Amino acid sequence: FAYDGLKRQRLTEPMVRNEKGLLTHTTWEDALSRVAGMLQSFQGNDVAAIAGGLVDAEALIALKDLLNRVDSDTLCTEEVFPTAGAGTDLRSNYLLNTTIAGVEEADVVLLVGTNPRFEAPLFNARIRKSWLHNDLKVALIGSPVD
Amino acid sequence: LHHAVIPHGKGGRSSVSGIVATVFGATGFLGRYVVNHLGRMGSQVIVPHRCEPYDTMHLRPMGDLGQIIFMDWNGRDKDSIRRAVEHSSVVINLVGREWETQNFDFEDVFVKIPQAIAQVSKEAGVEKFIHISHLNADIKSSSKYLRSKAVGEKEVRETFPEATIIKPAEIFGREDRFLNYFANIKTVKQPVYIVDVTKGIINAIKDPDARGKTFAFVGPSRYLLFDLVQYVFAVAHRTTRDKVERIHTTDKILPHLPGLEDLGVEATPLELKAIEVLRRHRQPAKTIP
Amino acid sequence: TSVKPIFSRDMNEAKRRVRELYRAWYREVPNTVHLFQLDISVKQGRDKVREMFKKNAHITDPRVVDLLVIKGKMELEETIKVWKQRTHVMRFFHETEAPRPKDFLSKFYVGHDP
Amino acid sequence: RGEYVVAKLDDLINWARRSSLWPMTFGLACCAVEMMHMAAPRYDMDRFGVVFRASPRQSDVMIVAGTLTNKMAPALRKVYDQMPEPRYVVSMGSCANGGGYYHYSYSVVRGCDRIVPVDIYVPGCPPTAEALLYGILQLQKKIKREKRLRIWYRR
Amino acid sequence: PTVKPPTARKFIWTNHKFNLSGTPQQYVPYSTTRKKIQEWVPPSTPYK
Amino acid sequence: RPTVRPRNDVAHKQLSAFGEYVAEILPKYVQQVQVSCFNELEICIHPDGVIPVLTFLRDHSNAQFKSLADLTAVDIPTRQNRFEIVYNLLSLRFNSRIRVKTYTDELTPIESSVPVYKAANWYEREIWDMFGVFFANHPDLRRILTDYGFEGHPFRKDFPLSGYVELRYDDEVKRVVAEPVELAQEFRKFDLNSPWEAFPAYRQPP
Amino acid sequence: TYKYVNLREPSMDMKSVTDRAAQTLLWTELIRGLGMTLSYLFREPATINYPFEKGPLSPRFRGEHALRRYPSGEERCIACKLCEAVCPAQAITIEAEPRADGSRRTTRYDIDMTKCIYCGFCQEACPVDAIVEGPNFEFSTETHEELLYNKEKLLNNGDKWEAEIAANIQADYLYR
Amino acid sequence: GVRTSPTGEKVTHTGQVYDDGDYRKVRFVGRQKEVNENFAIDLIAEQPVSQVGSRVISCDGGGGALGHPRVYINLDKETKTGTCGYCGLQFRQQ
Ligand SMILES: CCCCCCCCCCCCCCCCCC(=O)OC[C@H](COP(=O)(O)OCCN)OC(=O)CCCCCCCCCCCCCCCCC
Ligand SMILES: NC(=O)C1=CN([C@@H]2O[C@H](COP(=O)(O)OP(=O)(O)OC[C@H]3O[C@@H](n4cnc5c(N)ncnc54)[C@H](OP(=O)(O)O)[C@@H]3O)[C@@H](O)[C@H]2O)C=CC1
Ligand code: SF4
Ligand code: SF4
Ligand code: SF4
Ligand SMILES: [Zn+2]
């Protein structure tokens, strides 16, 4: 039901700041020329980028490639993950390695610091299915949410 | 931008170009090509016409449904000018006779009317204004036609400073009063093709660098009036005092002004198109380097 | 990989038919230009025929070539018999279509299509 | 006065031209049959001064009565270009008005107004012979409103 | 209708109109639906 | 039963017997024979058998199919031979009809049947025009229904309904010009098929 | 059973041969043909005096479309889109949403009268007698755009023509 | 409920009007905007609520086979009236 949010507060035009400091519509040529000029005058740590929560992989790699062309590695996300140890070197460090369908074969689930019902509702529905049909045992560490 | 004028489609008859153009003098020789090109890419075109609706019927098939709108206007009436321009984003002026009439002299059509359109357009908020003058416009000119153009060119530039003023040589084309003028009969002429002029005007609408500028639209080659006229009869296998003054006026050379090549339009030689114009009437002409 | 031939049993015999069709088209262009009172020069007409032929230079199936020749002979017949009108002959030249740019930036500015 | 003179000269040629409308009919398809029924005795278009069979060289109005295909579009435009002026076009039926029931076809021109200018659109698939007669009488009233001479005088 | 008059209704036109094509009263088509996508309006106060 | 079309067993048996008759006589070409529940006989043959099978049906004394009612094609993209060529013949002597079917693809030529029926002339031109099937030894194969210089075969299932180009008169060049098709209103596709099976008797095994 | 249209033997006796000779030379059949056209000159013509006289039409006649109302003035249309589904020409375009009072009603209802084939399938398919083809057939226009009806045009047609439309439906609805 | 906007254009019963900066209103210059002035939403609100003596009432819109499909309306709630989903007539229980 959130799709209706795709019809409102939409960005439909490039915008740059005018002499008043206010955003004003402009062409793709103008907006990109302004961005390119700044990009060509900076290097290394002077350039960074933060990726949001709905960004696709094609945009993520393109932006990575572009900042690498100016020798920047500051490609960051908004969602933290401890970089200590292996960090992101090994995929298994940050994956749901059992898979969603694997919950139906587990016999004990330990949930640590999370509310799966609202964070991953269909993943929580898959736990309840195991809890119902397999007598799965579930333990939680954290706030006693429903 | 406004949501209704964002371009859409692939630039064809049913597309949306984003241009809402009011074209004064659209029922003549240049206007038909201008309106045709505007409607090719899906522009909203307002056509203020002084003439019969019957004389505007050749413009109806030039735009998809609803894209060509017709209004009555009177050059002396400012309200009728206001009605036709207050919704447009660009106003194009192609008004002008090649002769004087008891009701309108060259001052009326080349000074009073262009200035009235420019004043109303400025007040109404129109952002783009394109005004057609002449290459040989000059207050020191023998031709009253060309003297009026120079004055009107000045008043247009002072009333609508951002106006793009275009100065073409004599234009040759199927309906022209140039090659057809000779075929029905010291000076160096540099005539320009009608389609090139049309593209130049359209490209000026789309180019922000063209605002406030004056252009000179001239063909690729300069000819001697005698040599050119000989060519016309060879291809065709064969009037007023002022008209003769203009045809005998050497085409000015204005290197400082931008031209068609600035607007990305490659000028077309007269030799590729002379047959097109003159076939209906049934060896090159030395060029001046 | 056993198939019924159209006309030619291998690409050698097919190339012969292509060359004969090309000669017929090449000789016809001056007549077409005159008969249809075209505003293109004979050189433009011949360069168009050449460009139409080179478009299919990469084919290696003798059956596909045979159909291309069969279609081309039909087009040539329609031109010689004056079954086509001048509008049909000039549709090879796309004279009222604005050049569509082919580089990335031009496409990006104008729309979404690749 | 000269105003009053052109007013009556306008009324005269306009009266003459709408009292003598000679059509040539592109009977392209179905709608031609209803056009024939308008010439038939019940409606007798000839009694309005509209002759039945007129050569294209002497025609004043073209009636596009039926579907205009892509293969036929060049021929329609040819005949229109050869009509001497003044000339008017009546578009008859959904097909000619805008493609109609074959609008989405690959071989059909979506409205004859893409090829020639049109003065009157007669709706229907097909319009009744009397509906077409209404459109013809509406063209006469359109001609009656013409003011070529008054505009010429004011040039 | 002098013998069997039509059924009166509140909304039926009291004044009949003839064909209005070619006059100032002619029908002009337009889309009866409202705008579907709302654009974001940038803030008025400066902040960069 | 008032609302149900009655069966005709006499005609069904008779058409089946003639189906075997033809198959026994021309085993070199007949691949299948079937009779529909509304009594229409179909002979499915190898394409090499066009001329022999049609000549036999026209001239044989117990056939005598003198009239070629219709000749058409059907595009079925899922088949490797996407085109199915259908001959519908009529016998006045025996007051009967028969359908003969063969197949081809975009490149394999079919033998022209003009020698057997002069009616096939324009029908085969239409098939070439609409489907792109080439008929060998046709006295005059060329388009018949489409515009001159028209590219493509409109009746193929993958040819779009509104085509690729559209015409208009352009005042700049003073002639009718062709341009890529743009529609003010796109044709609206409807998904009408119900997700529930209607005819169990035609179910295909999984 | 059959008959011959032209399998006759012309008599070759002198009387018959002279009958055909007199016919050839005296043009008797041609003069007989003149009699038939003469009898028509004195027949009353079948022309009617349009627009002061109209050709006869029945209550079922399919003419210009209109959107109808209930006696209270409420619109009959409920945006069910059965008309749009059946339209053979795809001439109808509909959009709908809940009205301010919660009713199921259209926000768009257009008919491209230059796509329409005037088949009447839409009035057959409508479950509430909302869309009809009325008796008007005299609505030719001077521009293409005038024939692209939207909901405001269609409702105005209903209000304009309801008196006659209701009487026509009253006459024919027992055959539906 | 015909209502003109600040630009003077009438707002239709679907709430449609061209905003100030919309070029598309040039189509009405020298002509007119077809607007039907009998708003169905206002007309049905003028109809009184019927008082009935049963929990369930049926509506066919009037005119028998000339109305809409016959439906049955439950009148158990007392907070609001029962509305016909086809014609919008309202019923209340007594
Ligand atoms: C005592 C001694 C006396 C000696 C003299 C005796 C002479 C009298 C006896 C001889 C009679 C002579 C008749 C002269 C008239 C011409 C007859 C004639 O030529 O008819 C033959 C001609 C062709 O007939 P066809 O069917 O084609 O067969 C022959 C072709 N191999 O048929 C045709 O003409 C074709 C028909 C053409 C006409 C069609 C259109 C008009 C028909 C109606 C006109 C009515 C007549 C109007 C009378 C005008 C009076 C002012
Ligand atoms: N073509 C050429 O050789 C050159 C042309 N130009 C300029 O280009 C413009 C158009 O060229 P062209 O198209 O050839 O001129 P045209 O005469 O071909 O068309 C002129 C237009 O002006 C309109 N017009 C003329 N006088 C009046 C008036 N008093 N009130 C209202 N409308 C009027 C005409 O409308 P109506 O049909 O109602 O008279 C017509 O539409 C002119 O300004 C001309 O000076 C410049 C250089 C060369
Ligand atoms: S508009 Fe209707 S009647 Fe006329 S040609 Fe087309 S389908 Fe036939
Ligand atoms: S009459 Fe037929 S074609 Fe016209 S809108 Fe109704 S269903 Fe569609
Ligand atoms: S007019 Fe009738 S069929 Fe069409 S959407 Fe409205 S209620 Fe449904
Ligand atoms: Zn109800």
Which residues of chain H lie closer than 8 angstroms to G129, CB-CB? 66-67
Instruction: Give the C-alpha separation, F153 to F163, whole Å.
Output: 10
Residue D112 marked as a ligand binder: no
- The helix (run of H) or strand (run of E) holding residue D139 is helix D129-144
Q: In chain E, positions 13-42, which contact chain D (CB-CB < 8 Å)?
A: 19, 21-22
Strand residue runs (E) in chain B = 20-24, 44-49, 68-72, 90-93, 128-132, 164-168, 171-172, 188-189, 192-193, 214-217, 223-224
Range of the domain at B182: 1-289
Asked if F153 contacts F130 with a C-beta cutoff of 8 angstroms, the reply is yes
What is the total count of domains within chain B? 1
Q: Which of F148, F163, F169 sits opposite D106 (nearest CB)?
A: F163
Q: Is residue B279 less than 8 Å (CB to CB) from chain C?
A: yes
In chain G, after which residues does the backbone break, taking C–N over 2.5 angstroms as a break? none
Q: Judging by DSSP bridges, how do beta strands H82-83 and H90-93 pair with one another?
A: antiparallel
Q: Please check whether residue F25 is in contact with residue F32, taking contact to mean a CB–CB distance below 8 angstroms.
A: no
- The technique is cryo-EM
Max Cα distance, chain A (Å): 67
CA of G23 to the centre of ligand 1 (A): 9
Residue whose CA is at the smallest distance from ligand 3 atom 2: D125
Q: Determine the distance separating the centroid of ligand 6 and the alpha carbon of G82, expressed in angstroms.
A: 19
Backbone dihedral region of A96: left (phi > 0), alpha (psi from -120 to 50 degrees) or beta? Answer: beta
Report the C-alpha gap between B48 and B57 in whole angstroms.
13
Distance, CA of B125 to CA of B86 (rounded, Å): 7
Q: Which ligand does the CA of B51 lie closest to?
A: 2
**Could you tell me which residues are beta bridge partners of residue B167?**
B216
DSSP string of C22-69, one letter each residue: HHHHHHHHHHHHHHTT-SS-HHHHHHHHHHHHHTTTT---HHHHHHHH
Q: Kind of pairing, strands G148-149 and G104-112?
A: antiparallel
B neighbour chains, 3+ CB pairs within 8 Å: A, C, D, E, F, G, H
Ligand 3, pocket residues at CB < 6 Å: D 29-31, 66-67, 93-95, 100-101, 125-126
**C38 and C82 Cβ atoms separated by less than 8 Å:** no
Chain E contacts of B66, Cβ < 8 Å?
A: 29
Asked if omega into G51 is within 30° of 0 (cis), the reply is yes
G119 labelled as ligand-binding? yes
The answer to whether the CB atoms of G103 and H12 lie below 8 A apart is no
Look at the block and give the residue holding tokens 């630039």: B11
| Displacement of CA G134 from its chain's centroid (Å) | 11
Closest CA to B218 of B250, B272, B170, B273: B170
Testing ligand 3's pocket by substitution, the residue of D34, D69, D95, D109 carrying the most ligand atoms inside 8 A of its CB is: D95
Of the candidates G155, G88, G64, the residue with the CA atom closest to the CA atom of residue D122: G64
The answer to whether G150 faces chain F, any CB pair under 8 Å, is no
Partnered with residue F177 across adjacent β-strands are F168
Q: Is G24 on the interface with H (CB under 8 A)?
A: no
Give yes or no for F171 touching C (CB within 8 A).
no
Mapping DSSP onto H, E and C, the string for chain F reads CCCCCCCCHHHHHHHHHHHHHHHHHCCCCEEEEEECCCCCEEEEECHHHHHHHHHHHHHCCCCCCCEEEEEEEEECCCCCCCEEEEEEEEECCCCEEEEEEEEECCCCCEECCCCCCCCHHHHHHHHHHHHCCCEECCCCCCCCCCCCCCCCCCCCCCCCCCCCEEEEEECCCCEEEEEECCCCCCCCCCCCCCCCCCCHHHCCCC
Exposed / middle / buried, residue F93 (Cβ in 10 Å: 0-12, 13-18, 19+): exposed
Say if residues B14 and B7 touch (Cβ distance below 8 Å). Answer: no
**G135 CA from centroid of ligand 6 (Å):** 27
B209 Cβ contact partners less than 8 Å away, ≥ 6 residues apart: none
- Asked if residue D86 has a cis previous peptide bond (ω within 30° of 0), the answer is yes
The preferred substitution site among B30, B100, B131, B146 for testing ligand 2, maximizing ligand atoms within 8 Å of CB, is B30
Which residues lie near ion ligand 6 (Cβ < 5 Å)? H 59, 61, 84, 86-87
The ligand whose atoms approach the alpha carbon of G119 most closely is 4
What angle do helix axes B225-235 and B270-278 make, rounded to 10 degrees? 50
Among all residues of chain G, which has the CA nearest to that of D126? G117
Tell the residue nearest (CA) to atom 8 of ligand 3.
D30
Q: What is the 3-state secondary structure (H, E, C) of chain A?
A: CHHHHHHCCECCCCEEECCCCCEEECCHHHHHHHHHHHHHCCCHHHCCEEECCCCCHHHHHHHHHHHHHCCCCCEEECCCCCCCCCCCCCHHHHCCCCCHHHHHCCCEEEEECCCHHHHCHHHHHHHHHHHHHCCCEEEEECCCCC
B217-244 in b/e burial notation, b at 16+ Cβ within 10 A? bbbbbbbbbeebbbbbeebbeeeeebee
Nearest atom in ligand 2 to B73's CA:
31
Closest CA to D117 of B55, B12, G114: B55
Both tokens of residue F27? Answer: 């085993």
- Are F187 and G93 a contacting pair at CB < 8 A? no
Look at residues F123, F84, F75 and name the one whose alpha carbon lies nearest to residue F104: F84
Q: Give the mutation target among G23, G27, G30, G36 for probing the ligand 1 site: most ligand atoms within 8 A of CB.
A: G27
**Would you call B3 and E39 a contact, using CB atoms and an 8 Å cutoff?**
yes
Rounded CA separation F168/D116 (Å): 9
Beta strands, E only, chain H? 3-4, 10-11, 50-52, 56-59, 71-74, 82-83, 90-93
Chains B and C touch (3+ CB pairs under 8 A): yes
Query: With a 6 A CB cut-off, is G111 part of the ligand 4 pocket?
Result: yes
- For chain D, helix (H) and strand (E) counts, in that order, are 6, 4
Burial G38-66 (b: 16+ CB within 10 A, else e): eeeeeeeeeebebeeeeeeeeeebbbbbb
CA end-to-end span of chain D: 17
- How many CA atoms within 13 Å lie on the side-chain side of F139? 10
| Distance in Å, CA D91 to ligand 5 centroid | 30
Numbers of helices and strands, H then E, in chain C: 5, 0
> Residue B101 to residues B97, B98, B116, C52: CA-CA distances in angstroms?
9, 10, 20, 55
Query: Is the dihedral angle over the CA atoms B61, B63, B67, B69 positive or is it negative?
Result: negative
Q: Do chains C and H touch (3 or more CB pairs under 8 A)?
A: no
Tokens matching residue D3:
């105003």
On chain D, the residues whose CB falls within 8 A of the CB of E21 are 138
